[PDB]
C-alpha cells in the first residue's frame, strides 16, 4: 500500500475528465429537437458512464474529502448508477417531450402560414371574407392526426422500436403533473397510460370558428372588419397558449439538462482535485 503510481493515476484521471467533458460538449450543445439529436445525447451519456465504470476499475483512491463530496452530490459503482437513472428517467424524457412537441408544433406553424391565403378582400372596404372552411379542415386534420397513439404524439413514456410503451396510471399521473399539462393529455392505451400532446387550443380554435356562423355558398365568410378583428385577437390568444405550453416544456427540459450538467461538474470538480493530488508534492 506504500508504492506510488502517479502516472497511471494521472492517464487513468485525464481519460476520464476528457471523456466526460466530450459528453458535457455534446449535452450542452446539441438541441433535443429530433430522434437523430437524442440518439447523439443518449449515446453522449452512456460514454459518461461508461468513462466512470472505467475510472471506477482504475486504482485511483479518492480522499476522504472527495468520498464525501460524491456521496453528497449522488462509491464509483454508486455514482455511475444514479447518473445513469437521472439520465435515462428523467433526463431522456424530457429529451423526447421537446423533439415530440417540436415536430408538433412545426405541423401548427405551417397551418398558420397558410392563413394569408385564407383572408380575401370582402364587398368593400369595410368587410373581409374569411375561408372559415379551409382553415378549420386544416386544424381538425392537425387534432385527429395528434389525438392518435403513437411515436408522434406520445411525450411519456419514450417510445422505441416496436409497440407502444405505457406507464401505470400513477406514473404517468407523475409526469402529467411534472409537466404542467391539462388533464386532457393523460391517455388510457391497453394495460397502462401515456401522455399526450395538449389540443386544448386547437379545439377551441375550432368551436371559435363555428361561432362566427355559417359561411355562405363558396364555404367562406363574409365579416365586417371589427367582427374578424375580434375573432383574430381570439385565434392569436389561442396561439399564444400553444405558445405558452411550448415554452414551459422546453424550459422545464433546459433545466433537466442543467440538474444533470450540475452533476456532471461534481465529476470533473473531482476529477479535476485527484489530478491535483497526484501532480502535488510536500516539499
Ligand atoms: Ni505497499
Known amino acids: 500500500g506504500h ?6 493515476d494521472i492517464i487513468s484521471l485525464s481519460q476520464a475528465a476528457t471523456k466526460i467533458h466530450q459528453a458535457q460538449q ?3 450543445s446539441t438541441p433535443p429537437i429530433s430522434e437523430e439529436n437524442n440518439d447523439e445525447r443518449t449515446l453522449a451519456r452512456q460514454q459518461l458512464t461508461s468513462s466512470l465504470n472505467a475510472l471506477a476499475k482504475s486504482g485511483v483512491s479518492l480522499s476522504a474529502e472527495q468520498n464525501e463530496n460524491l456521496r453528497s452530490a449522488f462509491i464509483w459503482d454508486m455514482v455511475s ?8 428517467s428523467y433526463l431522456g424524457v ?3 417531450v421537446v423533439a415530440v412537441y417540436t415536430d408538433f408544433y412545426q405541423a401548427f406553424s405551417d397551418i398558420l402560414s397558410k392563413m394569408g391565403g385564407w383572408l380575401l378582400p370582402g364587398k368593400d372596404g369595410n368587410t373581409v371574407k374569411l375561408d372559415v372552411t379551409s382553415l378549420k379542415n386544416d386544424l381538425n386534420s392537425l387534432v385527429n392526426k395528434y389525438n392518435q397513439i403513437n ?3 406520445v411525450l411519456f413514456p419514450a417510445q422505441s422500436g416496436s409497440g407502444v410503451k405505457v406507464a401505470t396510471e400513477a406514473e404517468a399521473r407523475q409526469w402529467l403533473s411534472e409537466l404542467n399539462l391539462p388533464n386532457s393529455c393523460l391517455k388510457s392505451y391497453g394495460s397502462g397510460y401515456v401522455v399526450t400532446v395538449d389540443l386544448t ?7 371559435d370558428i363555428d361561432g362566427l356562423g355559417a359561411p ?8 365586417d372588419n371589427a367582427k374578424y ?8 390568444a389561442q396561439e399564444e397558449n400553444m405558445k405558452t405550453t411550448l415554452q414551459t416544456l422546453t424550459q422545464k427540459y433546459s433545466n433537466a439538462n442543467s440538474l444533470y450538467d450540475n452533476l456532471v461538474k461534481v465529476l470533473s470538480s473531482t476529477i479535476s482535485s485527484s489530478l491535483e493530488t497526484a501532480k502535488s508534492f510536500l516539499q
Not at 508504492?3 to 497511471?8: D, F, I, K, N, P
Not at 448508477?81 to 435515462?88: E, L, P, R, V, Y
Not at 355562405?216 to 365579416?223: I, N, P, Q, R, T
Open 3 to 8: 508504492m506510488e503510481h502517479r502516472g497511471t
Open 26 to 28: 455534446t449535452l450542452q
Open 81 to 88: 448508477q444514479n447518473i445513469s437513472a437521472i439520465g435515462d
Open 94 to 96: 424530457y429529451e423526447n
Open 151 to 153: 411515436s408522434n404524439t
Open 201 to 207: 387550443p386547437l379545439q377551441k380554435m375550432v368551436q
Open 216 to 223: 355562405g355558398k363558396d364555404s367562406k365568410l363574409e365579416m
Open 229 to 236: 378583428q375580434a375573432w383574430q385577437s381570439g385565434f392569436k
